[PDB]
Structure formats: C-alpha cells, structure tokens
Amino acid sequence: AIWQGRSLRKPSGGRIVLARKKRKRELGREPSNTRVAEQDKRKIIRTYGGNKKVRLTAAAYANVFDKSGKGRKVRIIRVIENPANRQFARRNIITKGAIIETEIGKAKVTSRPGQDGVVNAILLE
Amino acid sequence: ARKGPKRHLKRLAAPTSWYIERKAYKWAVRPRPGPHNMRTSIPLLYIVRDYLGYAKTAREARKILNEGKFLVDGRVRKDYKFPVGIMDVVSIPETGEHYRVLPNRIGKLILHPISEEEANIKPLRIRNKRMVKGAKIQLNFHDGTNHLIPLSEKDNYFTSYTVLMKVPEREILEVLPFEKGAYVFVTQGKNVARKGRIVEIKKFPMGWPDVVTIEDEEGELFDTLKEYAFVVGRDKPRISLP
Amino acid sequence: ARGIVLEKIAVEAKQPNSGMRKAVRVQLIKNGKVVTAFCPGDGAIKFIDEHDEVIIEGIGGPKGGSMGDIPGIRYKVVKVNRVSLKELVKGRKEKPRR
Amino acid sequence: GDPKRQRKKYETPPHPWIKERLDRERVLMDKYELKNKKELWKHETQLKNFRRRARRLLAARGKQAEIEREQLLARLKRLGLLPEDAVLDDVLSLTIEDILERRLQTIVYKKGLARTMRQARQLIVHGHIEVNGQIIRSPSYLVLKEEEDTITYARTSPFANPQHPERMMIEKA
RNA sequence: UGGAGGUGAUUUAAAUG
RNA sequence: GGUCGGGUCGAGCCUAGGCUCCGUGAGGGGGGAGAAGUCGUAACAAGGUAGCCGUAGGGGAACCUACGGCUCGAUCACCUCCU
RNA sequence: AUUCCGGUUGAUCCUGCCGGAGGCCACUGCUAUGGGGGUCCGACUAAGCCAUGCGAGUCAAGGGGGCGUCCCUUCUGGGACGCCACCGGCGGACGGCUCAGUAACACGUCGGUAACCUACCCUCGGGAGGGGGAUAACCCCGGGAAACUGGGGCUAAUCCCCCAUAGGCCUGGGGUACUGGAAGGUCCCCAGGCCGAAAGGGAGCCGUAAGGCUCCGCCCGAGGAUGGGCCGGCGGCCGAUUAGGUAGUUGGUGGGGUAACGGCCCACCAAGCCGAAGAUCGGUACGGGCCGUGAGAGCGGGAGCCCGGAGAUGGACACUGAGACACGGGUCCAGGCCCUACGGGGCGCAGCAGGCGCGAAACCUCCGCAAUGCGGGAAACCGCGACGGGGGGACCCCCAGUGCCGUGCCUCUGGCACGGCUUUUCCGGAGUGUAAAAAGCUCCGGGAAUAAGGGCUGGGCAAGGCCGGUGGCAGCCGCCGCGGUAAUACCGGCGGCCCGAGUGGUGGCCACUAUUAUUGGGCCUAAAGCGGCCGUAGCCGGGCCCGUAAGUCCCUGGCGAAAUCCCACGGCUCAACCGUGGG
Ligand SMILES: [Mg+2]
Ligand SMILES: [Mg+2]
Ligand SMILES: [Mg+2]
Ligand SMILES: [Mg+2]
Ligand SMILES: [Mg+2]
Ligand SMILES: [Mg+2]
Ligand SMILES: [Mg+2]
Ligand SMILES: [Mg+2]
Ligand SMILES: [Mg+2]
Ligand SMILES: [Mg+2]
Ligand SMILES: [Mg+2]
Ligand SMILES: [Mg+2]
Ligand SMILES: [Mg+2]
Ligand SMILES: [Mg+2]
Ligand SMILES: [Mg+2]
Ligand SMILES: [Mg+2]
Ligand SMILES: [Mg+2]
Ligand SMILES: [Mg+2]
Ligand SMILES: [Mg+2]
Ligand SMILES: [Mg+2]
Ligand SMILES: [Mg+2]
Ligand SMILES: [Mg+2]
Ligand SMILES: [Mg+2]
Ligand SMILES: [Mg+2]
Ligand SMILES: [Mg+2]
Ligand SMILES: [Mg+2]
Ligand SMILES: [Mg+2]
Ligand SMILES: [Mg+2]
Ligand SMILES: [Mg+2]
Ligand SMILES: [Mg+2]
Ligand SMILES: [Mg+2]
Ligand SMILES: [Mg+2]
Ligand SMILES: [Mg+2]
Ligand SMILES: [Mg+2]
Ligand SMILES: [Mg+2]
Ligand SMILES: [Mg+2]
C-alpha cells in the first residue's frame, strides 16, 4: 500500500521502468495523528526483526521540563500552532515541534509521539 | 538467496585456506557461527577425518566426536560444524597429543605439534575495549571472546596488546604490550607466517589503517598492516612457532 | 525447412547454356510462404508428386544464394516423404505408399 | 560465459593436397609403420610445442624464466632426446625423426625383440612386452632413458621361453 | 629535335545486318 | 465476526480524442530479367550537325534548339609562346 | 606458416569484388568393432498446455491417551515392554528449475554505514518468586453427493494468560571513565514518563529416606560470528530520416514514516535540475568469471560449471514468522480446464521421469540413502528425483582393433599357395569389484576366427588422354567453365587419389582481408578534396630561466574467490583426467 523504495524518476527527468516486485521490507505504515483528548490511547506495533513500537493515538498529559532540570506531569489544553502542517492546529494534531498550552504555560514538544509513545516538552518562558 | 539465509556450501566455493580436494564431491560442510571468522578457521570434521585420519567416513567421525575424545582450548567439543581457528589448541588426551592451529607460508591452516605444558596457554590479541555497566572494562579478543577487568586496571591494557590466558579456567597470567622491540608473528597478507621485531609505526588521516615495519632474523625489513601483526613475546617468543 | 509441393515446373538455363532444369513450388509449414526448389539428379523429378512433403536446404551459391546457370532458385530438395532423394535417384531404397 | 571444452591435442595441415608434403609424410608413414595421419600429426605437434617454448625462453629474462629454462632442459634429457651437456640452442635442431625413435614400437624393434615393425606392434598390443615390471599396450608410448634397458618379454608370456618356435625365428635374424 | 596555346575555315544526299 | 458513516489507496471496466501496427484492396507508377513483336539510328572515326555539364522550352522514341562553360575534339592554313 | 591461388584482354599491367584452401558451433545423407575420462543432450519455435507416481521432514529423554505381550499380586491395580494417532517443538525462506522482464546502482571493482536488522552458534556477567485458564486426543449425537464441517461432555504439558522484580525506550539538567581519524555512541549522578522476562522443565544413578552428582535444557544484558539491508566513486551496447527534456520536477525549512539515511511521502518557500563531451525517446539484451578465432594489434559470442540478479499462467494485495508479500501455503480480477446428486467444489511440472503441441532441432513413467551434504534428534538414527548408480544417444576428448612370421609364384605395391605363431577384440567359465548389480581388472578352455566406409578423379587441387552409353536432350557447375554423334568434365564399368570409424551436405562466427587500416589503407586520370572564403568549441602549437609535482617513471603496503590457462613432479598401465608447488 505505502511504498518507500525508490523514486520512479531520474534526476535528469527521465522515467524508470521497475524491474522487480515490491519487497515487504520496503513498506510504510499509516501516520499516527496524535489528537488532544480527555483520555490517553496507545497501541503496540510488531516491527521488522520482531521488534516493537509504541504508537500514541490520543494524548491527555504531557511531561514539561524547565531549564533547571525539574519535570512536571500536567494535562494538555490545546495546540496553539504547528509549523509542520497549515491545518494541524485547527484539528489539534500533536507532532514534534508543535506549540502546546498547558496549565503552567506554553511549551514546545521535543518527542516523536508516533515513535516513542509519550509527549515531552520544554517550557517556554 | 532470494528470500532467506543460505545453509549450503559448494566445494568449488570453499575458503582458500582449507586443505580440501575441491573436485572430488559436490558439497562441503557449511561451518557453524562461532569464535573466529570464515577466513581464519575450519570445521572440526575436516580435522578429525581429513587432517588426522582417525576416521574414514563422516558417520564414524561423528561417533568419535560424540563420545568426547577431542578438546578445543581445554573444552569438550561435539559439534562437527564447530570452527577451529588461529592460535587454538587441539588436544587428544586418549592419545596424549596436542597441536596449535597456525597459517602456512601460503596462507593455509596447519597443525603444529607442541608440548603438553604449553598446551595450557592461549595468546589472545586485544581487538576492542569498552566501558560496561557498573563502570567496569570489557576486553574483546580476536577469537570473539570477552573478559572483565576493574576500573583500577584501565592503564594496563590497550588495543593490539596480547594476553596469555590459562585455559579452560580463563585466568590472566601475562600482558604483552605492542611497542618497538616486541616480537610479532604475521597472520594475514602477503608476508603471512613471517616473524620478527618491530622497528617503526606509521599512521594516516581519515581512517586508513596503520602500518608497521618489521625486522626479521636474517636482517631484512618488511612492512605489513598493524592489525596483521600478532605479538607473541618481549624479545623472544613465548610460544613455540615453526 | 519442411514444405508441401503444389506443382512441378521447368526453368530455362541462362545463356549461353541450353536445357531445362526441373523444380517444384513448395509451401512452407512454418509460415505459409511459397518458394521454388531445385531437384538434383538424373530423373529425380519422377520421384516427386503433388501433395507430397519435402525437406529443402540452401542450394549453396555465392553470398548464401543461387548458383550456376539457374539464378532465381535458392533451394534444393533433400528428402521426399522422409526418404533421402539421393538414395531414390540411385536406388538402394524405395519410395513408400506407392 | 562458457564452461571448458576439451580440445584436440594435434593440428591438421593448412592445405590437404600439397605434393611435397604428401611425399615426405608418405615416406615417414611407411618407415615407422604408423596407422594413420593423425598419429603422425600428434608427434609433429609435440615437436612444435617444444620449439615454441625455446623461442619464448630465449627472449625472456627474470626469475621465473630461468626456472622454466632449466625445467625444459631437464625434461628433454629425461626423455632421452638430448645429451647431458646440451644447451637451450640445441632445442632448435631437433627433428621429427628424433621423436619417432622414442616410440615403444620403434624401441622394441631396435632392441631385437621382434623381426619387423609390424611384429613389434602386435607384440605390444597383445601384451607380450613389459617395461620396468609393468605391461603397457600402447605402441605410441614414449620411453624414458632411465627405463630403456629394463624392457623385456613379459614373465607370463609364451615368448619368455627360449625354446618357443616363434622366438627362435626372431632370434635367427 | 620536340612541345603548348589562339583565330579562321570544312561544296548535296548515303538507313540497316 | 456482521451492519452503517467517513477518509484514503487501487488492478479491472466503459466512452470519447489523438498517434501507431499487421491483413486485404479497385485503380495508378516506375525498376529488374527474358527474347525479339515493332518504329527509327542518338553515341563510338570529323560516327557523317564534335561530344559533354548547368538552366529553360519543344518533340512518337532515342533526341532538337537557345545562353554561359569544359576538352575527356579530328583536319588544313596562319599567328603567338617555349625547349 | 607473419603464405597465397582461379576469374575482366587477341595479348599486358592495375584498381576492385566474388570464389577456393583452415578452425569451431547447430541441423542433416551414407556408414560403424572395443575401452577409458568429462563441467554434454526440449536453450533457438511455445515463460505453450499437462493424465499418473514421486521431489520436506523429524523428535517417545515436552504431554495426556488407545491397544497388545508378559511379571508381582491381582475382585480393583501397580509395573515393564512394543506399535498408533493427537496436542506441542524445530525445519519447510535452503536446496532444485528457467532466463520472460530489466539499459538499472542490475552487474564488476574499490570504499562507507558514527544511518541498520539478524532464529540457530561462541565468550563473559546475572536470573528462574507467586497465581490462573482453556482445549485437541478420548466418549454421546450428527450434517453434507462431495470438498469439508456442527453441538454437548472431560483432560495435560517445555501450550496460553496475569502479579512482582530484573530489564528496555523517549526527554530535560550535570560529571568527564572508553573507543576512534573524528562522538547525535559507550560509562556515572539527579528528574518526568511509557513498555515490560523466564520452563528448575526433562532423563539417569548414589539416595531407607532426607539430598547430592552428572547430562540435555529456560529468561535478561555486553560483544563477536553468520546471513542480509542501504549508500558513493570508477568501468563495460546501437540509432539525429529521435533536439530540446523535467513541474515532487531540483534544492531549502518543518514534520511523518521506516530496522535504518533519503522527495521515501506531506505542509510551506524559491527556480532549480539534465542536454551536441548526445539529454530525452526508440531498438536489442539478464551481468561477470570465461569461450571461439587470429603471428600479434584485434574481431565475434556469452545456454550447460561457479558467483550475483530476476520469475513461478498475466495483473494486483495480505497473514504467520528471525527471515516471504512464500514454485509442491492464503485473497481478488482476467483467461483456460476438471468433478457435480446442479445446490456446490477444485487445478496451472520454467522439480525428476512421462505425454501432447510446436518445429530442422533434444533420452528411462528404472535402483539407492552405502558415499558427499542438509533438516530434525541427548544419541543410536530417520527423510531427501539434492546427490550418488546404472538405462538410451556418431556430445567432447584420450588410447586401441579389423592379424603376425618364413619360403615360393605372379602384373612383384599387393594378391594367391604352403608351413608355423598370437588372442587386443569375440564365445563360454572362476575370483575381485558393487548398497545390490553392471562395466572394469587378474586367471583358465576354444579359435584367424567376429570386424571398412565416405568423398573425389578438366583447372584451382592429390589422382585416367582407357572402355560402354547419351548427343545443346538429359545432366554437371562454390568460381572458371563442360555437353551441338570421335565428351580425359554428364551416366556406368575397370583403374587411381585423400582421409579413415568415420566421411560428405546446409546455415552461422573468426581468418583469408592493409575489403575498416592505433600498429597499417586510399581521394589528377580508377569510388573519393565541401564552388570559394571568414571564424566558435575541439585537436595541434617557437626559444631561455626559476617553482610545483597533476600526467609520466621507479620502490613498497592492501586488494582483484574458486574453476578455467602455462610449467615441473606425483596417482590412475601411459594419456585424457586428478593432486602438490611455481607462474
Ligand atoms: Mg574505519
Ligand atoms: Mg550467462
Ligand atoms: Mg549518328
Ligand atoms: Mg545525318
Ligand atoms: Mg553527331
Ligand atoms: Mg525545336
Ligand atoms: Mg576492361
Ligand atoms: Mg572472399
Ligand atoms: Mg519449453
Ligand atoms: Mg513452502
Ligand atoms: Mg526458494
Ligand atoms: Mg530503452
Ligand atoms: Mg553498486
Ligand atoms: Mg551507469
Ligand atoms: Mg510485567
Ligand atoms: Mg527526519
Ligand atoms: Mg530476453
Ligand atoms: Mg551482453
Ligand atoms: Mg540447459
Ligand atoms: Mg507453465
Ligand atoms: Mg540433437
Ligand atoms: Mg523427457
Ligand atoms: Mg543436534
Ligand atoms: Mg594433378
Ligand atoms: Mg558443389
Ligand atoms: Mg566416349
Ligand atoms: Mg566416372
Ligand atoms: Mg584500397
Ligand atoms: Mg575544391
Ligand atoms: Mg579558418
Ligand atoms: Mg616548446
Ligand atoms: Mg604520482
Ligand atoms: Mg582466480
Ligand atoms: Mg603409475
Ligand atoms: Mg604424467
Ligand atoms: Mg587440478
């Protein structure tokens, strides 16, 4: 379905004719559009070589860090902005680099919730 | 290999360091993963059947192995696929003989007879060295094995040094540094199986490997890769070599 | 190649020779094309009949083509109903099914 | 690519009908009682190969060339084609007649074990001749100098009896 | 001895194997 | 695992548009062999009007004529330039 | 052998092409006694279609049962013993087959991963505490034409699920213990989170018992090994009667996704990227080691063996698993086909044999796991159309036979007559050989007995100026040329020549050919100097002095698998073939 193998175009602009079928080790997966919700929800993915990934689909809390090294677990109000996609903020989609507002103020997300399963942010002064 | 690991090996594609008749049969033994690498070792079946001649067929070689008659580095080995490599000791106690595995002047593996006393020690070149949990040091040797030392000893071991180890107890008894005036034995390359003393060491930028100049007994100087030079003594050999 | 005989013909030799060279028109099995083939030997044309199958091969002239006083013919008959024509012309063997 | 194909050990003439070559080869065939042309051609090729190695070694220099140079001389004197003090230039004066004189057929006839070349061939093929204790049935086998004098009747042969009727007729010659 | 150029002229008809 | 909503990906299928290819094809056109049914004699000797190139017009057919060019043109007389 | 010979004229010298003479490959006419060795035999057309049998299993020392023979007692039983299936574990992703697609990071070669995954194996450091659960087998009842498949009862595990601990991953703040050329890596201390182990199981003895003493095992962490993924530089076809091409296209910023880097995919911002040193498009084709030929420079090919790639009727797409989008496993569409009680259900030999079709073009529906190896098992072992052994075949190469000797006669090469000899080969036996057979090899008895063809005969080109037929008819002819009633050339007889278990025909590549020319060709009259000139890129460029060290030369480290080639020595009787060393 989602193939991540190679481009069908040469850098000169010419076309490429595929010489083999798609291999299983080349496939992607659906993106996790991590939403703000009242409750948390995550799932576990079995991956190449029999490994695991923790995929967060709905987030209600965040771990917020200061410049002094102290962290606090607080709840997420909403997404103020997200430079990754022009309409993520309207839909409350959380990714790395998004600006979120919490009970203790705005913060910038430093984690990849689709890969790690948690939301970590640095508190903005 | 279209979809999975290879498990077979044709005779014509066997490693060049084995003493084997390459056209007599279709198949060769595919060695099992283990201590050494493919270029520096040989399966034990060829030692029992082809080299020593204690068995004529594979079936009776396996019966000899399963009864526990062959020791490698002081430990019983029953797997006929077990890889036996450079500097190992092969022991037969029911006959009272011992050998060290060493490369030829042409790069082929041979058995060198040794004394019963010298059979208790194996020299191990230090391939890598790292920190490990609890802040201890792990030493990774050329035959793939490992050892632990306390943090207070960290200045007595570095890569390319050789450690003489008592087997099978695995107890250290001597450390031989890599420096000028040390005695070395070449294990790979064009100058394989030549031995001598270290004269100079040279280094280069961007990860190209370092090279050593060595003086032999008759007074000739030759170069090789540093990682091909295996320390065996201070100014005289500490093991018996041809 | 193998083919089926459609008719017998005769080709005049080129100047300054004189004589009639006996040949056949053959339709090839593999693609249906029709070609002319020479019948070598004295009296050889008498061993051929319409609807018979023949095996033909090159006549052997320069540049892989025709030869001698018969340009336009590029092939010659070698077998007739799976029997060697050379034998039939000499003897030693008989043409089957009458 | 293509795997190995086993190739002929002899070379054929570049033109089948040249009068002078035909006459020369007919004389050789009659004299040594060879069975066919290819047999003769085989020996010719052997000679050519020897010369081709000498021509290449004269114009060579280095360390492997010397080893090859002495190996060629040693092999040639082991077969009995050169004396013990020959040099490389002497390789270029060898003739086809030198090689044919080393055939087991010829040597059996030269020693006086048969009366004719044809009889020597039949004695070899039927198994009446031993070479250094071994029975060999190939008349074209080239005899080494070290074993030339240990060539006799087989110890199980009818001819190994000085009273055999056919042996007495051979001895009368 | 032998050569290279220029300008003038050319008195009917006459096919074929 | 069934039923419904939404998103998204997708072989196949249908219609139309444009190119491309094979198969037959009334009729038209030169090319090559054959051997002579026919009309003439254009090219070779000054071939009976020297031959040939470019362009243009004309004629059953080879061909003819006009302007400019070449010698890969015979004969005699005179003149010029050389060895 | 670093080669020539015939053909344009009444006769001559040239240019130039055609033919002859050599090697190798595929089909094929006629004809054939023996052995040995080898990497030979449905590749060319149809990656067309396939009846039947076989090509992947194994573990009883993981677990409850069924049944049988026996021992102690037995109302009942406990034991031991031996088969059966089921649950459970590992393997089935290798090996085998073919060359359709592909002009591409597919392949060769040198490097990189500090940007990654890895069941089985090796070393070292640690761990195995507490709970629960169903279900096959088995018994009751069944459905369906079949393929298949339903309900109730009962049961175990090294089966499955929870709790704890160990452990793992992400982010923020400090410290500097390690490797390395260089730390987004390793190690230590605080802090917020999320994920989250295990079978002390099995077998045998010393055990009165208690408990040891071995063997095979279970889980986590660090490193290696093995098998792979990804990336870069460089190298190897034809076409201009294809000149402009590209618009996720090229780069940037912010994310997602992946085992992992990446326009791999998105959102936003720019106008980039390739091209006459040939882009793009079209044609043909799996790449290499190697193979054919030639004095060499070169030219041509790349089925068979080894290494890499791809595919399983065509086109799409998933489940399990360490590894697959899986040839003898699953789904949809398309196209054929088989069985139906008509409701339904199944199958694609480019595995080994075997059949049909296509064609000029290719074998037995055999025997064995004894050897070499692979999977499983603690082991003894078991399975394997891989592999090994034979059967068929003018596949390639090596070594032989179809008689020998003496004395006479002839036309004296050779044939015939006498006298004698031999047994490779042939016929019948014993031994050895073999998994069993067969071949082969050593011996014994019989006996010259059982064994020669194909092409050519005017010149090139070795070999008849003889005889009988035919009469520009029939026929021959690579080329030049013969045949028109007195043919050395057609048909036949007798002679002769070449090669010989082979010898001729047809098609292809190299040579011939200095008719593709770097070595090494031509252009006044023979094919060929643009009608003339100016100039862009490219190629080619005057003398001296100083510097550099890219080209270039010399020395030395790491590489370019094996097989294939050359040499000596050694093992099969020698050889072909095979081994050990040098190149
Ligand atoms: Mg490095
Ligand atoms: Mg190939
Ligand atoms: Mg005229
Ligand atoms: Mg006129
Ligand atoms: Mg005129
Ligand atoms: Mg006019
Ligand atoms: Mg002429
Ligand atoms: Mg030619
Ligand atoms: Mg086929
Ligand atoms: Mg399978
Ligand atoms: Mg496979
Ligand atoms: Mg293309
Ligand atoms: Mg590459
Ligand atoms: Mg390229
Ligand atoms: Mg847990
Ligand atoms: Mg990223
Ligand atoms: Mg193809
Ligand atoms: Mg190719
Ligand atoms: Mg094949
Ligand atoms: Mg098929
Ligand atoms: Mg064939
Ligand atoms: Mg078959
Ligand atoms: Mg095992
Ligand atoms: Mg002659
Ligand atoms: Mg002919
Ligand atoms: Mg006559
Ligand atoms: Mg005749
Ligand atoms: Mg020329
Ligand atoms: Mg000009
Ligand atoms: Mg100019
Ligand atoms: Mg200059
Ligand atoms: Mg340099
Ligand atoms: Mg090699
Ligand atoms: Mg021998
Ligand atoms: Mg030899
Ligand atoms: Mg060999």
Please describe the biggest sheet of chain A, giving its number of strands, its sense, and whether it closes into a barrel: 5 strands, mixed, barrel
Q: What spatial form of chain A do the alpha-carbon principal axes imply? A: elongated
- Spatial strand sequence of the major β-sheet of chain D: 2-1-3
What's the β-strand tally of chain A?
A: 8
Q: Strand pairing plus helix content of chain D: what structural class?
A: mainly alpha
User: Helix-strand pattern of chain A, N to C?
Assistant: EEEEEHEEHE
Straight-line distance between termini of chain A:
44 Å
Strand content of chain D: under 5%
Number of domains of chain D: 1
- Describe the biggest sheet of chain D? 3 strands, antiparallel
**Ends distance of chain D:** 61 Å
Secondary structure: helix percent of chain A:
under 10%
Radius of gyration of chain D (Å) = 19 Å
Subunit structure (chain D): Part of the 30S ribosomal subunit. Contacts protein S5. The interaction surface between S4 and S5 is involved in control of translational fidelity.
Family (chain D): Belongs to the universal ribosomal protein uS4 family.
GO biological process, one term (chain D): ribosomal small subunit biogenesis
Function (chain D): One of the primary rRNA binding proteins, it binds directly to 16S rRNA where it nucleates assembly of the body of the 30S subunit. With S5 and S12 plays an important role in translational accuracy.
Can you tell me about this structure?
This is part of a larger assembly, with chains A (125 residues), B (242 residues), C (98 residues) and D (173 residues). By secondary structure, chain A is mainly beta. Chain A has helices spanning 88-91, 113-116; strands spanning 35-36, 41-47, 51-59, 61-65, 71-81, 99-102, 105-109, 120-123. In chain A, the strands form two sheets. Chain A has a five-stranded mixed β-barrel. In chain A, a hairpin with a 3-residue loop joins strand 2 (41-47) and strand 3. In chain B, a hairpin with a 2-residue loop joins strand 2 and strand 3. Chain B has three domains: 1-119, no CATH class; 120-178, no CATH class; 179-242, no CATH class. Helix content of chain B is 7%, strand content 36%. Chain B has a five-stranded antiparallel β-sheet with strand order 3-2-5-6-7, with no helix packed on it. The longest helix of chain B has 9 residues, at 44-52. The radius of gyration of chain B is 19 Å and the shape is globular. Chain B has helices at 44-52, 58-66, and strands spanning 41-43, 71-72, 75-76, 83-85, 89-92, 97-103, 109-113, 121-132, 136-141, 146-149, 162-166, 171-176, 183-186, 195-202, 211-215, 221-225, 229-233. Chain B has 242 residues and is mainly beta. Chain C has 98 residues and is mainly beta. Chain C has one domain. Chain C is 6% helix and 40% strand. Chain C has one helix at residues 85-90; strands spanning 2-12, 20-28, 34-38, 53-58, 75-80, 83-84. In chain C, strands 1-2-3-5-4 form a five-stranded mixed β-barrel. Chain C starts with a strand and ends in an 8-residue tail after the last helix. Chain D has helices at residues 19-32, 37-58, 63-78, 96-100, 104-111, 117-126, 165-171; strands at 129-131, 134-135, 151-153. In chain D, strand 1 and strand 2 form a beta hairpin. Chain D has a three-stranded antiparallel β-sheet with strand order 2-1-3, with no helix packed on it. Classes of the chains: A mainly beta (125), B mainly beta (242), C mainly beta (98), D mainly alpha (173). The chains hardly touch. Chain B binds three RNA strands through helix 2, strand 8, strand 9, strand 10 and strand 16.
